[PDB]
């Protein structure tokens, strides 16, 4: 089992983008995929003013600027992998499409419509 | 003789010969919300009491009398004071804390009833 | 004792005691619009069913004994298994698709118990 | 197996009043409706009373209607059946039975299917 | 009530029939009709139930049926251990839920 460093596309697909502090971070994730099988990693970043939400064309943002330094520490709770694909599998990191990002905390839930009526026979009459 | 709370301040067995009086008045697009949201109100309010009669039993009715038997504690007074002296507002305060009580006690009995009367068909 | 829907691993004669349990639940414009549709869809659907009962002759009623007969075709199952080992999903399963069929029988029943009824006054 | 077993007092002056009961084992006492029946010293059996397997219906013979009570108490496992008045016509064999009615979501009985032993109770 | 009052007799290996007669609105319109045998100084057993039906634990000895009005209780290979008074009872209806018929004595001869 390998892991590699996402293949090319676009800033916001192949970095690990986040929001934090108010600013939109691209941070290159190749430190954290590169190995075979299994102090501190850094990974430098880069930052945009110019947002282009989600996959949408025609609506961009512009995010003022933060005064002073920002500082912020969060979990990695998870991973989204693909598998590039005869004795070994390469999984790079993938995204783009949010819907995965939910479903990773939905997926125990369930809608259902409750049905209250019923009928069955029973040893009476009317 | 009287319109719509008009025996407010009547007597609680002079009241309750009015009851259809108050029964019948229970019945921009940010503008229309707001009538409308009032309007489902109405609706909803409407029927959850009326799930409520049904549920004791009293359905249809607008005097339903039940087999739960009074607590004395819950008012210690005989029907001289609560139907001829007693207002329907005093009288809503005086047994506020034993709303749920009572009410608790009306389903129960209800369900006991429609039981026995499956089992006797 | 249990809540919404705690009965509904339990079979069908040891649920159908909880029957009110389940009966209780039932009850920027544009985020006000999606709101107001939840509630009036909750409303009509509790009203199709309340009016269904009344043309079986069931208002009022959770438990409901009517005049139709069963049709040994429709679940060939003793008393036994259906209340003491069966669960209503089950039931529900096994029975789906003689619904619409049961249904119009009570009607029927009831139509000709209301004429008769008229006829005896 | 199972038992009924009845207890009780076995005499009386008329006009006076009896409790007799009835202790059960060996299954589930809550499931089934219970009854009572005479056995007249010199003659057959009477149907005298029987009540629910809840305790919530009871049913008389009639020229018992007026005086007796049948009770139950499902935690106990206990039938109990008070008599009032008492007359020299109830001299008999006072039998616990198991059976007699029903519950709508099951199979009907109406029939006795287990018998106690039976107190005597002697009205002078 | 129900009536048969005469006792009943037949020597081992002979067949008996035990009557019990009601009315129609009574044994005729309710198929509930059970047998009870009972040992001088015993608890009554029970041997049919319904109309035909036996209990587990009840031989195949004993048998049943109903015509009409009338009901009866067959006894086959006839024992000596069959010496009982036996009942038959029915379900009148509501408001006058069961009666009983006199029993019959059985002897075996």
């Known amino acids: 089992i390998r892991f590699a460093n996402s293949s090319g596309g676009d800033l916001e697909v192949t970095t690990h983008s986040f929001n934090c502090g108010g600013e939109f971070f691209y941070c290159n994730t190749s430190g954290l995929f590169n190995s075979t099988w299994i102090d501190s990693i850094t990974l430098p970043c880069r930052i945009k003013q110019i947002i282009n939400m989600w996959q949408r064309i025609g609506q961009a943002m512009y995010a003022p600027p933060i005064q002073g330094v920002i500082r912020c520490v969060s979990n990695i709770t998870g991973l989204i992998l693909t598998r590039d694909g005869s004795t070994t599998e390469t999984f790079r990191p993938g995204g783009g499409d949010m819907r995965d990002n939910w479903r990773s905390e939905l997926y125990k839930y369930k809608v259902v419509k409750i049905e209250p009526l019923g009928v069955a026979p029973t040893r009476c009459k009317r | 003789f009287l319109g719509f709370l008009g025996a407010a301040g009547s007597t609680m067995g002079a009241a309750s010969m009015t009851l259809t009086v108050q029964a019948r008045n229970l019945l921009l697009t940010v503008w229309g919300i707001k009538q409308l949201q009032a309007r489902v109100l109405a609706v909803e309010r409407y029927l959850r009491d009326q799930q409520l009669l049904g549920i004791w039993g009293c359905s249809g009715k607008l005097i339903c009398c039940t087999n739960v038997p009074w607590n004395s504690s819950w008012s210690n007074r005989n029907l001289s004071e609560i139907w001829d002296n007693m207002t329907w507002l005093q009288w809503d305060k005086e047994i506020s804390n034993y709303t749920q009580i009572i009410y608790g006690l009306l389903e129960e009995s209800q369900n006991q009833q429609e039981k026995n009367e499956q089992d006797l068909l | 004792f249990l809540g919404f829907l705690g009965a509904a691993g339990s079979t069908m004669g040891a649920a159908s005691m909880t029957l009110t349990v389940q009966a209780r639940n039932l009850l920027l414009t544009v985020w006000g619009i999606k709101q107001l549709q939840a509630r009036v869809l909750a409303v009509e659907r509790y009203l199709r069913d309340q009016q269904l009962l009344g043309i079986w002759g069931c208002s009022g009623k959770l438990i409901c004994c009517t005049n139709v007969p069963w049709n040994s075709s429709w679940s060939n199952r003793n008393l036994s298994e259906i209340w003491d080992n069966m669960t209503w999903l089950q039931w529900d399963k096994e029975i789906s698709n003689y619904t619409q069929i049961i249904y119009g029988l009570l009607e029927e029943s009831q139509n000709q118990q209301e004429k008769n009824e008229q006829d005896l006054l | 197996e199972v038992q009924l077993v009845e207890t009780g007092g076995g005499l009386v002056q008329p006009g006076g009043s009896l409790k007799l009961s009835c202790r059960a084992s060996?299954?589930?006492?809550?499931?089934?409706?219970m009854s009572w029946v005479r056995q007249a010293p010199g003659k057959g059996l009477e149907w005298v009373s029987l009540?629910?397997?809840?305790?919530?219906?009871?049913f008389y013979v009639d020229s018992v209607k007026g005086r007796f009570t049948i009770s139950r108490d499902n935690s106990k496992n206990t039938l109990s059946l008070q008599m009032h008045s008492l007359r020299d016509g109830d001299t008999a064999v006072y039998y616990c039975?198991?059976?007699?009615?029903?519950?709508?979501?099951?199979?009907?009985?109406?029939?006795?299917?287990?018998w106690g032993q039976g107190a005597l109770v002697t009205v002078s | 009530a129900l009536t048969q009052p005469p006792s009943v007799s037949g020597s081992p290996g002979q067949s008996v029939t035990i009557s019990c007669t009601g009315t129609?609105?009574?044994?005729?319109?309710?198929?509930?009709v059970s047998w009870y045998q009972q040992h001088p100084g015993k608890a009554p057993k029970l041997m049919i139930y319904?109309?035909?039906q036996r209990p587990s634990g009840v031989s195949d000895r004993f048998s049943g049926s109903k015509s009409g009005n009338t009901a009866s209780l067959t006894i086959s290979g006839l024992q000596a251990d069959d010496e009982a008074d036996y009942y038959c009872?029915?379900?009148?209806?509501?408001?006058?839920?069961?009666?009983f018929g006199g029993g019959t004595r059985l002897t075996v001869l």
């Open positions: 060996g299954y589930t006492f809550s499931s089934f409706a």
């Open positions: 009872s029915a379900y009148a209806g509501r408001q006058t839920f069961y009666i």
């Open positions: 039975a198991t059976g007699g009615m029903s519950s709508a979501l099951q199979s009907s009985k109406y029939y006795f299917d287990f």
């Open positions: 319904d109309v035909t």
């Open positions: 009540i629910n397997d809840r305790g919530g219906l009871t």
């Open positions: 129609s609105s009574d044994i005729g319109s309710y198929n509930y």
